[PDB]
């Protein structure tokens, strides 16, 4: 019944809670990105997300609850990260729109955090971007329904060790993992499965300890029989990322949540000292 509001143009995602599609407003030709997801509590929170308004958060239009679905309707964006990152694959995205592309989705995620809202599932497959240079935090995260498998490139290490309180610091994780491989052309930590990559972080970042993560030795999902790598050092992770990159990424991959540097924080780096806003070249 719904569905005759708007017309079907093309299949855009098997997002992680159902189907994406680019869709035109039958009556207001409105050209909106409808999701569908197959089924009160979350009709409540999901209601208030129609609040959380920031030009980085791509715009929650509409909640529809209606025979056994939930549809949730969003401005249109024309593309992904992960499209533009693979599109740019031979030649990098330049490190002005790395920059710009940044410090945009730190100003995001500082909205969100200011109102205690976490994203949960940040990957460059949620980060839209339209021809203006603008980048935008969609489909916030609170198998896929195609049996696709969830990245698990993207998560913290306190979510891998079994943490049950997420905090805001999950998201700056995320972050800093698609900063890394936006600079380098590969995923960080490409693991295929929770102790792969658990163990990817580690054999990078050095196995945490009581010494940098107080606590990690108590944490649900720890074991002391993970082998013991030393650290590597960040001009080998992300070159050839200048000095104050390579700063900014060391505090946004901090072990210890609490010692991860904020989004408020981390728009205050003197890495965005000479941040702009390019113009992407985007092929619609
Ligand atoms: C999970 C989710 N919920 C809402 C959206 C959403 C919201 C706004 N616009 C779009 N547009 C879009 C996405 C991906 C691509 S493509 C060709 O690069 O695959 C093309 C256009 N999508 N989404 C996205 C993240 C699917």
Known sequence: ????????????????????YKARNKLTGEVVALKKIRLSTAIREISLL????????????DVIHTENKLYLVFEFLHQDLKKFMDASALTGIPLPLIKSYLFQLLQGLAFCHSHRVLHR?????????????????????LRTY??????????????LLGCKYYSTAVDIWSLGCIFAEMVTRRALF?????????????????????????G?????????????????????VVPPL??????????????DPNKRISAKAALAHPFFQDVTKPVPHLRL
């Open 50 to 61: 129609k609040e959380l308004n920031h030009p980085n958060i791509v715009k929650l239009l």
């Open 190 to 214: 490409p693991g295929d499965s929770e102790i792969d990559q658990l163990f990817r972080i580690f054999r990078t970042l050095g196995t945490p300890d009581e010494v940098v993560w107080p």
């Open 146 to 159: 195609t049996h696709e498998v969830v990245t698990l490139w993207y998560r913290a290490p306190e979510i």
């Open 242 to 255: 200048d000095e104050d990159g390579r700063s900014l990424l060391s505090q946004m991959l901090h072990y």
């Open 121 to 141: 599932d940040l990957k460059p497959q949620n980060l839209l971007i339209n021809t203006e240079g603008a980048i935008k935090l969609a489909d916030f995260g």
């Open 1 to 20: 019944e719904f569905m005759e509001n708007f017309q079907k143009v093309e299949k855009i995602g098997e997002g992680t809670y159902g189907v994406v």
């Open 216 to 236: 990690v030795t108590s944490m649900p999902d720890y074991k002391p029989s993970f082998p013991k790598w030393a650290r590597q050092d960040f001009s080998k």
